[PDB]
Amino acid sequence: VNCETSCVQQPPCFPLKIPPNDPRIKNQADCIPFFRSCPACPGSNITIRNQINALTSFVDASMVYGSEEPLARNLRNMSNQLGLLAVNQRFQDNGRALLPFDNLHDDPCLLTNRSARIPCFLAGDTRSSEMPELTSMHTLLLREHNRLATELKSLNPRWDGERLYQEARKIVGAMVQIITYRDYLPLVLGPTAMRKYLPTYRSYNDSVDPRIANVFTNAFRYGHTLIQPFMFRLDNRYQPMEPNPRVPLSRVFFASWRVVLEGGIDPILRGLMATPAKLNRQNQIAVDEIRERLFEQVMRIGLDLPALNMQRSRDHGLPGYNAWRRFCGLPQPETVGQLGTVLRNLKLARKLMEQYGTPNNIDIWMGGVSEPLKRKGRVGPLLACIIGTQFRKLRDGDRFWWENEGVFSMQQRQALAQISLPRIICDNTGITTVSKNNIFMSNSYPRDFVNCSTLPALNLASWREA
Amino acid sequence: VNCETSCVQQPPCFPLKIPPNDPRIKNQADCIPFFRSCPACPGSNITIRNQINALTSFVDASMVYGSEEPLARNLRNMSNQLGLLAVNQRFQDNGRALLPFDNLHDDPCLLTNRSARIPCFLAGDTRSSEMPELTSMHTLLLREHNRLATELKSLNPRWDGERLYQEARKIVGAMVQIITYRDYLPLVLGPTAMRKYLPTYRSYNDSVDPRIANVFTNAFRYGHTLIQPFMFRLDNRYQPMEPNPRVPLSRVFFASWRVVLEGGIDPILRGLMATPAKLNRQNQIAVDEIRERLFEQVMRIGLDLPALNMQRSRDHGLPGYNAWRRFCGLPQPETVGQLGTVLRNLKLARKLMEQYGTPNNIDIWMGGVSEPLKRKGRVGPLLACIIGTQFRKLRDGDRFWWENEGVFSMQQRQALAQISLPRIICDNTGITTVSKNNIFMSNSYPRDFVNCSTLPALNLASWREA
Amino acid sequence: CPEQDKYRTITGMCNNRRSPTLGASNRAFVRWLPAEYEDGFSLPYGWTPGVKRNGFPVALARAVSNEIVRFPTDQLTPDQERSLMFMQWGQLLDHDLDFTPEPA
Amino acid sequence: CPEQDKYRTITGMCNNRRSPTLGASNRAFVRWLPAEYEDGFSLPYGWTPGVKRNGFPVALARAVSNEIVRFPTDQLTPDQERSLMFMQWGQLLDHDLDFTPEPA
Numbered sequence A, B: 001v002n003c004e005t006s007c008v009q010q011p012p013c014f015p016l017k018i019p020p021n022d023p024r025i026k027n028q029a030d031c032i033p034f035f036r037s038c039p040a041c042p043g044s045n046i047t048i049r050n051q052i053n054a055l056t057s058f059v060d061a062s063m064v065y066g067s068e069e070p071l072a073r074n075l076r077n078m079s080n081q082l083g084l085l086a087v088n089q090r091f092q093d094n095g096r097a098l099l100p101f102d103n104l105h106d107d108p109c110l111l112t113n114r115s116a117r118i119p120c121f122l123a124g125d126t127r128s129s130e131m132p133e134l135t136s137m138h139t140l141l142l143r144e145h146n147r148l149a150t151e152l153k154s155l156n157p158r159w160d161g162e163r164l165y166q167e168a169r170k171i172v173g174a175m176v177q178i179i180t181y182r183d184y185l186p187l188v189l190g191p192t193a194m195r196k197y198l199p200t201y202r203s204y205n206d207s208v209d210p211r212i213a214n215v216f217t218n219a220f221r222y223g224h225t226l227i228q229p230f231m232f233r234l235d236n237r238y239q240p241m242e243p244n245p246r247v248p249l250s251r252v253f254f255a256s257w258r259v260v261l262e263g264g265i266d267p268i269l270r271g272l273m274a275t276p277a278k279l280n281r282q283n284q285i286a287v288d289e290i291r292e293r294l295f296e297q298v299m300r301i302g303l304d305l306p307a308l309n310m311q312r313s314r315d316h317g318l319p320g321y322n323a324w325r326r327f328c329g330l331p332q333p334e335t336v337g338q339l340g341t342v343l344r345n346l347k348l349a350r351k352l353m354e355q356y357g358t359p360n361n362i363d364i365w366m367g368g369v370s371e372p373l374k375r376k377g378r379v380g381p382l383l384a385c386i387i388g389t390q391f392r393k394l395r396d397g398d399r400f401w402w403e404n405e406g407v408f409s410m411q412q413r414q415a416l417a418q419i420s421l422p423r424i425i426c427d428n429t430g431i432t433t434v435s436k437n438n439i440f441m442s443n444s445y446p447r448d449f450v451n452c453s454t455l456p457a458l459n460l461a462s463w464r465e466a
Numbered sequence C, D: 001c002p003e004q005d006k007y008r009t010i011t012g013m014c015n016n017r018r019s020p021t022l023g024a025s026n027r028a029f030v031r032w033l034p035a036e037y038e039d040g041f042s043l044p045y046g047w048t049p050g051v052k053r054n055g056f057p058v059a060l061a062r063a064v065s066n067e068i069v070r071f072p073t074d075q076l077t078p079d080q081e082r083s084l085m086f087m088q089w090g091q092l093l094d095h096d097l098d099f100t101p102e103p104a
Ligand SMILES: *[C@@H]1O[C@H](CO[C@@H]2O[C@@H](C)[C@@H](O)[C@@H](O)[C@@H]2O)[C@@H](O[C@@H]2O[C@H](CO)[C@@H](O[C@@H]3O[C@H](CO[C@H]4O[C@H](CO)[C@@H](O)[C@H](O)[C@@H]4O)[C@@H](O)[C@H](O[C@H]4O[C@H](CO)[C@@H](O)[C@H](O)[C@@H]4O)[C@@H]3O)[C@H](O)[C@H]2NC(C)=O)[C@H](O)[C@H]1NC(C)=O
Pocket: A196, A197, A323, A326, A327, A328, A329, A330, A385, A389, B205, B207, B208, B392, B393, B396, C032, C033
């Protein structure tokens, strides 16, 4: 049974059925396409069905380098001894490198503009082309690797290709860890949750299970609440870059042609820096660009991302809201009144109650994004517990964590302490004005912007082997 | 193949290698027979191999009733509406019920005495004939079920077969829970570990995982250190049952014929009551009856139970001693000196280090039984933690726990509180003098004994339907 | 696992030497809580018509989205203290952490 | 799982309503800690010649048994405070809780 073209419920399809008086799909014979996640143990009449993580759990920039040896190999430039990642051999972004194209059997990117004939990009992860803003970040890190590899070849002449690649790969990974725990996570969790779930690092602990928990795959989708209905692009002076400065997100998904033919990554990165994220409010959860029109250009029907999240949590056999609250040592509301109190919103509690009947059955993504956000944070207590617990494990249970004794020298850690996302943008783009740290807070130009010249670039002197 | 008859290491075999100059197995290229436990997900290149529990984890007397429906039905007497368990149709024990014979493909009991032709017994669990003492306990509870069913039938004449069976089964399960938690576990863990891991029952908690943990299957094998090298049989005045009151254990394994043809279960049960268990000591861990001659009559050579326990822990991918110490929140000895301190025995720690190299690699069974015993307990801190944690889960995570609200009436719970192993023996055997409570401590006749006549019967009045 | 190494493996294998596949690719996720399936081992809630979950009807995912998530875009509240880069780093980071394969 | 029931099922199924296989027969054991195999996923330590466990040779179970467990039978110490029945209930109870199947 073809899950993409049929609404029949049979393995491995789990189509979302359509309710009566649906705002968009008036045909209740239709459905939202859904493929069940691959079972870890197919056909077993013994195991409790589990799902598979195809990537390394570690914050190791695997979305740059890949999580399988064949891929990691194919992503490298193996035509010289410079330790570089291969770049696009058909296009450049105002002199700079693009990601190589991929060879996909049913390339969705081509369908976003039949004229353009621009396929999806090839990267460490298979979703790099899903939105141009994501593609731009992959492109950024790709360039930083090559730049590091180049400077590294300068400091240490003897270092061969393999050495260059690995040392450059090691710095990029550290950069991803640093940006993530120093700048990103504190603004996700807020002050209190950050102190609680990520106490000061001590050192590697080999008893700390670093695997991603099934529940994390759904809870961390909290980000879907931060999505704006447009892709914003701005010129070198951060003004709307015509003729299409604000394209609907439903016409940017897999649109790799926009990166190649519409100005490169500079206009995209500026848009990310100088545009406010959407705020998560209890009656403004997620925009219709993803709730009604997700992937509209590349399949028979527009998808509903929030709907997919709830369908997926059930596909994965994930416990309901109260089980996760209990797990997190948080009170479990049983009445609509109790729920109202936990949510500080009686109206929302009522809607949830009328849909689910009991707070025990609220799907984890729905319940999670439904809680009022913690002070200076962007998730509630439940998601904070789930996300913070996950990241502590990814940190403490990683033998190659950048601060672990032995990974980097004391002076190498000093050097890495000076890296920033703004700085990386400065080193690999035409953009000479970038957001002030913290880049995830700054969002108003020119008030929150500074010239690149005032920001010190990574000093690799302590990488000298001499 | 046949792991029982060759030393080839190929699936599903994992034969134990023999050390040079072994005191028994002189051909260093030979081995000890061992079959890998069945994997939960056969041939998987994704899943981390795990093993299977073929039994219900709950303390529900499944060793009596069966944990699979077809077997469950086959243990039941369906020739009438008396709700009884099937009994042996060939033999009786001084006018009382024996377990029925099983129908095995390569029946090992047949091999223990070729001229007797007595096959293994059929029970709720497949190991009932492993040793006559075990067989005797199985027989006891079978009788207790039929006794309870009969009494309930007189009190409740309208109650059909199914109802009587279920009600009797429920009582039997309750008895096993009570004897286990009131009488048995306190003497395993010691008072301190009992308060710690087994605090006052409050109520059923549907979020408590009641499954058996993999390590428990190995850790609960601490009981192997309690085994005496003989099966003791006593007559009705508790004196040696001639002509052979002390049978070497190596000649009673799977020896069902001894139950049927050598006096039934009375001499066996008296033997169990009036003989001390073996005390575990650091230089007296387990006897050669099981270390050199385990299953000698039904195997090509004698097996080694202690060595099988360690091979099994490896087969199951179980972490070493220190990881389990860490899990349990106990200090992790890293040097011989430190291990010496933890064990209160530097010599033993020295022997362990000469064999293992590091405390991190000591097998859980070996490390576990090596620890000094807790006060008034028969295990050390590590085993105390593992066993105590397992039983807490089995109690708190069981919706049919005898003390759980709604399972039994208040009147029923009061009646059940009066049950005891000594009284059950009185009710189902020809024995008229039994051990004083606690039956697990009492071990010296006549000192620790009394007449059955001084012990009241279980009052079933509150099971009468009004 | 090599007694000594210099860098991460590409698959993550051997990061944890005592349990070599932890954190590595193409491995089952860890369960922080026992899974909850309609049949207890494999079918998702909402699969079989009439089958409730814990005493109540399973709500259609699309119905919950329509009822609780749907909102008029003109009400959208720009986050005064977060840049859109905050959203983007999130997605990028999610793609360093987990990808859950499905059949083609 | 039925709405109400007065008796346990034979298999243990439905004891836990939210996750009905928990404690039920013919299911994998729960792991309190990650498994430790030679190849990370299935080969037991002692399987491959020359393969050490965390820097030291895997000690033969039979050697450990010989050097540490073996003791003179006539040295056996009778437990003054426990009956043999204490041993026997243990095994009987163990057989209510777990049986790890092996191919015949
Ligand atoms: C019903 O039983 C539930 C299970 O209880 C366990 O089993 C019973 C038999 C007892 O032995 C009991 O003591 C056991 O805990 C029980 O739910 C449990 O409740 C606890 C306490 O709230 C929960 O612990 C909290 O966990 C969260 C999440 O992290 C945990 O899980 C991860 C993944 O395995 C581990 O890596 C962690 O180390 C934890 O184990 C933590 O965030 C939280 O700690 C934080 O908060 C406390 C307090 O501020 C601080 O001390 C810490 O430093 C942290 O800041 C706790 O560790 C547990 O997750 C939960 N389990 C389940 C299955 O839900 C429930 O309360 C019982 N109800 C009743 C009425 O008895």
